[PDB]
Amino acid sequence: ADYDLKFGMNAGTSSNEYKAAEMFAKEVKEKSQGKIEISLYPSSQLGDDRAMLKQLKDGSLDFTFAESARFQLFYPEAAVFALPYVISNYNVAQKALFDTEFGKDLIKKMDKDLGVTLLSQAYNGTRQTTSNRAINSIADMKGLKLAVPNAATNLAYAKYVGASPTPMAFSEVYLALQTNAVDGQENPLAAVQAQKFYEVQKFLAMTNHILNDQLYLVSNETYKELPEDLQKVVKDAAENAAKYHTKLFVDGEKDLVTFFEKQGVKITHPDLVPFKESMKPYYAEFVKQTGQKGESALKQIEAINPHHH
Ligand SMILES: CC(=O)N[C@H]1[C@H]([C@H](O)[C@H](O)CO)O[C@](O)(C(=O)O)C[C@@H]1O
């Protein structure tokens, strides 16, 4: 094709992210009259999300996914997106990114500093905790070996609840669970399904600890080369795909607990009051480390009403 473009992702071929990326690719091919074709590179073939963000910056990868929270790697205050229990729901995540001064500035910085254009934002699920033994209360987290991504906020979730985190690449998690190198992991339900972590975990606890969004990002090097009518095709397709992507996750969160029960998984509902209480010293450390910018981001986000209006 005139533009042979590439979209990399950590998620695999059985995932919501991949399905939505397929919809995106199909719409762009059709509405560009075949001028643009987008090929998909799942399961971290090109590296992880940190690596793929570097490839967008350099112009060697055209599209990828990232959470708003991932930008904490560059702007420490952006950890507010994944401080456990701070963002209440997806409604708040959306307004946090697009309708706060903090969020609007982050979008500008992604463009200026990091070579990426934000096309759309989707919901990617609320993280829960699976394990090889029941989590009936926060006491059961003590010493639990928990696989987490290489991200400060997930490491902190594990630390502050009393667990023992092992950070690793997403591709490595299944084997870690299967071999009992670790005792558990903490992705959203959709990923527990997609990766078939249910095959190698007997328990699921509704910790509801971190809310994931998902940004459709394009390399500025690629987006600048597309005539404006093709920029519009890509932007519109990303917005349409994001709506679909969100719906896949919303519907799954309704249906998946029953799916897991049918596969033999036991579901628990630990009291979350102590989980939330345990994060108070982490929020204080966040404010200590990130200073006024962090305090301000927190204030802006805490001001957002979570009820749709
Ligand atoms: C966009 C993207 O790659 N998201 C990935 C996230 C983020 O890397 C992490 O939450 C830090 O932001 O990690 C996983 O949940 C994980 O490894 O458990 C897999 C998921 O596909």
Numbering used by the authors: 1 to 309
Which statements did the authors publish about this structure?
We investigated the significance of this interaction using the sialic acid-specific SBP, SiaP, from the Haemophilus influenzae virulence-related SiaPQM TRAP transporter. The first structure of a TRAP SBP revealed that the charge of the carboxylate group of the ligand, sialic acid, was neutralized by an arginine residue, Arg-147, in SiaP, which sequence analysis had revealed to be the most highly conserved residue, being present in 98% of TRAP SBPs of the common DctP family. Using in vitro, in vivo, and structural methods applied to SiaP, we demonstrate that the coordination of the acidic ligand moiety of sialic acid by the conserved arginine (Arg-147) is essential for the function of the transporter as a high affinity scavenging system.
The R147A mutant protein also crystallized in a closed Neu5Ac-bound form, despite effectively reducing the highly conserved charged side chain to a methyl group. One of these water molecules (water 1) is present in both the R147K and R147A structures, although the other water (water 3) is unique to this structure. Water 3 also has a higher B-factor than water 1, which manifests as an anisotropic motion perpendicular to the carboxylate. This mobility translates to the neighboring water molecule (water 4) that moves by ∼1 Å with respect to the wild type, concomitant with a 0.5-Å translation of the β-strand that bears residue 147. There are no additional waters present in the void left by the short side chain of Ala due to the aliphatic patch behind the arginine that drives it into the binding site. Hence, although Arg-147 provides important contacts that are essential for high affinity binding, the required coordination of the Neu5Ac carboxylate in the binding pocket can be fulfilled by water molecules allowing these mutants to both bind and close around the Neu5Ac under these conditions. Interestingly, we observed differential growth phenotypes for the Arg-147 mutants, with the more conservative changes in the R147K mutant exhibiting growth more similar to the strain expressing the wild-type SiaP (doubling times of ∼120 min), than the R147A mutation, which resulted in an ∼50% decrease in the growth rate, giving a doubling time of about ∼180 min.
